[PDB]
Design an enzyme around this catalytic site. Structure first.
Site, PDB file in Angstrom:
ATOM      1  N   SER B 151       6.415  36.593   3.186  1.00  0.00           N
ATOM      2  CA  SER B 151       6.670  38.050   3.321  1.00  0.00           C
ATOM      3  C   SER B 151       7.993  38.366   2.625  1.00  0.00           C
ATOM      4  O   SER B 151       8.181  37.857   1.487  1.00  0.00           O
ATOM      5  CB  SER B 151       6.566  38.437   4.774  1.00  0.00           C
ATOM      6  OG  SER B 151       6.475  39.851   4.939  1.00  0.00           O
ATOM      7  N   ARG B 221       7.722  50.656  13.421  1.00  0.00           N
ATOM      8  CA  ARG B 221       7.219  49.317  13.781  1.00  0.00           C
ATOM      9  C   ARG B 221       5.735  49.374  14.143  1.00  0.00           C
ATOM     10  O   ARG B 221       5.005  48.418  13.824  1.00  0.00           O
ATOM     11  CB  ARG B 221       8.088  48.715  14.892  1.00  0.00           C
ATOM     12  CG  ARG B 221       7.627  47.366  15.394  1.00  0.00           C
ATOM     13  CD  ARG B 221       7.588  46.286  14.310  1.00  0.00           C
ATOM     14  NE  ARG B 221       7.730  44.932  14.836  1.00  0.00           N
ATOM     15  CZ  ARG B 221       7.985  43.844  14.131  1.00  0.00           C
ATOM     16  NH1 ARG B 221       8.179  43.896  12.816  1.00  0.00           N
ATOM     17  NH2 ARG B 221       8.061  42.677  14.763  1.00  0.00           N
ATOM     18  N   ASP B 314      -5.033  39.650   4.501  1.00  0.00           N
ATOM     19  CA  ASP B 314      -3.737  40.376   4.406  1.00  0.00           C
ATOM     20  C   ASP B 314      -4.006  41.779   3.849  1.00  0.00           C
ATOM     21  O   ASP B 314      -4.532  41.907   2.739  1.00  0.00           O
ATOM     22  CB  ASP B 314      -2.791  39.608   3.484  1.00  0.00           C
ATOM     23  CG  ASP B 314      -1.336  39.982   3.610  1.00  0.00           C
ATOM     24  OD1 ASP B 314      -1.070  41.161   3.868  1.00  0.00           O
ATOM     25  OD2 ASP B 314      -0.517  39.052   3.464  1.00  0.00           O
ATOM     26  N   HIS B 344      -1.651  39.757   7.469  1.00  0.00           N
ATOM     27  CA  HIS B 344      -0.309  39.349   7.005  1.00  0.00           C
ATOM     28  C   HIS B 344       0.395  38.491   8.050  1.00  0.00           C
ATOM     29  O   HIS B 344       1.005  37.492   7.673  1.00  0.00           O
ATOM     30  CB  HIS B 344       0.468  40.586   6.661  1.00  0.00           C
ATOM     31  CG  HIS B 344       1.747  40.263   5.993  1.00  0.00           C
ATOM     32  ND1 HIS B 344       1.791  39.596   4.782  1.00  0.00           N
ATOM     33  CD2 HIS B 344       3.036  40.433   6.395  1.00  0.00           C
ATOM     34  CE1 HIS B 344       3.075  39.443   4.437  1.00  0.00           C
ATOM     35  NE2 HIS B 344       3.839  39.976   5.374  1.00  0.00           N
ATOM     36  N   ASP B 345       0.249  38.846   9.323  1.00  0.00           N
ATOM     37  CA  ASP B 345       0.848  38.072  10.429  1.00  0.00           C
ATOM     38  C   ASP B 345       0.344  36.631  10.423  1.00  0.00           C
ATOM     39  O   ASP B 345       0.990  35.791  11.097  1.00  0.00           O
ATOM     40  CB  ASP B 345       0.648  38.763  11.783  1.00  0.00           C
ATOM     41  CG  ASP B 345       1.840  39.598  12.221  1.00  0.00           C
ATOM     42  OD1 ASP B 345       2.890  39.596  11.556  1.00  0.00           O
ATOM     43  OD2 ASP B 345       1.682  40.302  13.248  1.00  0.00           O
TER      44      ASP B 345
END
Ligand SMILES: CC(C)(COP(=O)(O)OP(=O)(O)OC[C@H]1O[C@@H](n2cnc3c(N)ncnc32)[C@H](O)[C@@H]1OP(=O)(O)O)[C@@H](O)C(=O)NCCC(=O)NCCS
Ligand SMILES: CC(C)(COP(=O)(O)OP(=O)(O)OC[C@H]1O[C@@H](n2cnc3c(N)ncnc32)[C@H](O)[C@@H]1OP(=O)(O)O)[C@@H](O)C(=O)NCCC(=O)NCCS
EC number: 2.3.1.31
Lengths: 366, 374
Positions: B151, B221, B314, B344-345
């Site tokens: 990332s 967030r 992702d 992505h995580d």
């Protein structure tokens, strides 16, 4: 006599009286704004209901004029020889229940003479279908030839087909799923949180105060607009290019950032934050399976001929959802794949391909 | 001059002095916070630089405690026989320039005795590399065996490889692209806008006022967290299910909504909004081709052996970007796919798959270091 249809292109205000909503709240004295194109047939059997999406209104087609700042949201879709050929069909569009362009919504006055605001009930897609059916009934129309819509309009169309299959001959369900997904609820609920976080929200009772949570709605619309785009097309259009002469390395904007800021402001000049909240919550509520044994049972129950369209690059209502609809709706002959780079917004931008799907739908309607 | 490494696991504050930034602004009196695991070899040839992502810090591995609210963000990655085998490697992680966990950032005191806040310079990924290089140089370290990161940490790793190829043996570049994309800038700039819209932002000078734009950072967030997820996995996990006994038809919450609310609050308890802004703008600035004739020329002339990892699901750094890195970098043997439903995580969640990419990177670096003489 019935309520007369408005003159072609003009807004008619149809007063339908109280509406008992799905959650059991009774919403009194509802008005639904209507526009229509084309003559109603003597038998009243030629209506094509055009169902708008989150920020749309009754202004389906036509130029900017008096009452309408911009061209129709599906400009050219209805007219002589158009995909909805008004030489044969009567195209009718409402402003949805909860709207801000003539229909009863949060900015409208409650019985107590103050805007509904925080007292506006939570409405569902099924409540929107009921308001539209009631408006049509007041105009003397008890059945429609077809329902067409994309996005929230596709959720309205799908609920109309599943709830009232005896009173629709065919439908176009474009760029939507059978129920809201976790991602959709996540972005919808967070968009609403962005509006409620704005100190000018005033608990939803900002109407008439001279302050409004436009900043929070612009934030919500910037994020929504990203969900509406194709990722590759957006990067091909803007990449990491700066806006004009600005220098992002010393605090200037990128082109994509400037474009999103512009899209936010455009919505702030034409659309109510409270309507954004109510309609976003109605999208999160979407579930054709509720009270019917779940999505598979509800779709299999519906025998109506249906054109199901999905956009290959859609990031908000990914094509797996339209494949599901196509597999389960017995009146669907197969998924119509709109092979487009333009994401979910393809349902507005791909006028030629969406028009082809409307012509197929109106063939099925006969 | 040469500063000692901190004891294993503990924070060391390395004072690197003034740093000339890419935009020409001079940032005085910079401090970089460092954690390390493993001994430094006498020849200083065994350093593995672990580069954190947007909300990460120097706490790569180990439990909560000694001033860390939670376990390491890559807990388990470094240790005896682990993917970073500390019997052989010295794993070093900084807190990034602009951070809020010991390094110089918007919350830090400027020369005038007030927080930097609105006066904090715009920094780039290249500024982040330059600060980390300076922190290593102050510790007597001029060569690194490997850079590893996902990332933002992959952006840092990729700039390090391209900028300092003679001083890195190998790299792992995970879940990033060669430059920021329009979508990434769109979401990053809109997240920043959600923070700056919060009336407690106070133009960026909220530090030490007793008010902070936590509400706007929570909104940011929640949107970021959706970009980090796999769409299908999120729907399989939560669908449109309500939270507990709440009734969404009368204003209650959905399960995914409650989950996003929780994720925003957890960040607000540990992370500075001004840092979120500075590091999001640094991500938007990412471009390995800037001043180098563009991304294709910059990557084609970079000779460093590199493992490129991309995650199938992702949505923020889609796999086409890692296919592009793997084709252009001549030292990349081919794209390593992380087959994961976690979006992505996955760079954080898929510890076994990511661990195998790290171990391969370091087996490569060990072979190359045996043949590297300094
Ligand atoms: C116009 C539309 C049809 C698609 O085109 P688009 O993606 O907006 O592309 P355009 O280049 O035409 O951009 C439109 C505007 O952006 C402006 N623009 C383009 N690049 C810009 C930049 N870098 N900075 C600022 N403004 C910019 C243009 O000046 C233009 O102005 P205008 O619309 O007032 O004439 C759009 O309405 C759409 O499809 N999405 C709307 C979704 C919607 O309404 N949703 C609510 C219910 S879902
Ligand atoms: C490391 C990380 C990716 C791990 O994700 P994961 O293992 O898949 O875990 P999840 O995303 O399911 O999160 C589980 C948490 O959600 C909570 N949760 C789950 N469902 C919930 C619900 N409906 N309502 C509220 N909370 C809920 C759990 O209680 C748990 O809380 P906890 O972490 O305090 O124990 C995650 O901790 C994270 O996102 N944080 C790291 C930082 C990051 O993504 N970005 C920073 C730089 S990119």
């Amino acid at each position: 006599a019935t309520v007369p249809l408005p003159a072609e292109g003009e807004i008619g205000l149809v007063h339908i009286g109280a509406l008992t909503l799905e959650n059991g709240t009774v919403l009194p004295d509802v008005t639904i704004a209507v526009q229509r194109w084309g003559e109603l047939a003597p038998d009243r059997g030629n209506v094509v209901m055009v169902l708008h999406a989150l920020t749309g209104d009754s202004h389906v087609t036509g130029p900017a004029g008096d009452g309408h700042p911009t061209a129709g949201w599906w400009d050219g879709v209805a007219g002589p020889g158009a995909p909805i050929d008004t030489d044969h069909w009567c195209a009718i569009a409402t402003n949805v229940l909860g709207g801000c362009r003539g229909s009863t919504g949060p900015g409208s006055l409650a019985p107590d003479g103050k805007p509904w605001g925080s007292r506006f009930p939570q409405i569902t897609i099924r409540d929107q279908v009921a308001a539209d059916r009631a408006a049509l009934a007041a105009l003397g129309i008890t059945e429609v030839a077809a329902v067409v819509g994309g996005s929230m309009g596709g959720a309205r169309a799908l609920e109309w087909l599943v709830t009232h299959p005896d009173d629709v001959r065919a439908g176009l369900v474009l760029a939507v799923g059978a129920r809201a997904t976790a991602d959709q609820i996540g972005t919808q609920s967070t968009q609403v949180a962005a509006i409620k976080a704005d100190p000018d929200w005033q608990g939803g009772d900002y109407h008439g105060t001279g302050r409004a949570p436009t900043e929070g709605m612009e934030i919500a619309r910037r994020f929504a607009h990203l969900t509406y785009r194709g990722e590759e097309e957006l990067d091909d259009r803007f990449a990491n290019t700066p806006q004009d002469d600005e220098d992002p390395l010393t605090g200037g904007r990128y082109a994509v950032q400037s474009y999103l800021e512009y899209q936010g402001g455009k919505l702030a000049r034409r659309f109510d934050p409270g309507t954004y909240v109510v309609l976003s919550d109605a999208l999160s509520s979407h579930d054709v399976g509720r009270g019917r044994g779940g999505v598979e049972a509800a779709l299999r129950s519906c025998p109506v001929p249906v054109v199901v369209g999905g956009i290959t690059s859609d990031r908000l209502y990914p094509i797996r959802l339209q494949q599901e609809l196509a597999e389960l709706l017995p009146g669907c002959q197969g998924l119509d794949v709109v092979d487009s780079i333009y994401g979910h917004d393809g349902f507005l931008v791909e006028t030629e391909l969406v028009g082809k799907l409307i012509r197929r739908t109106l063939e099925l309607a006969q």
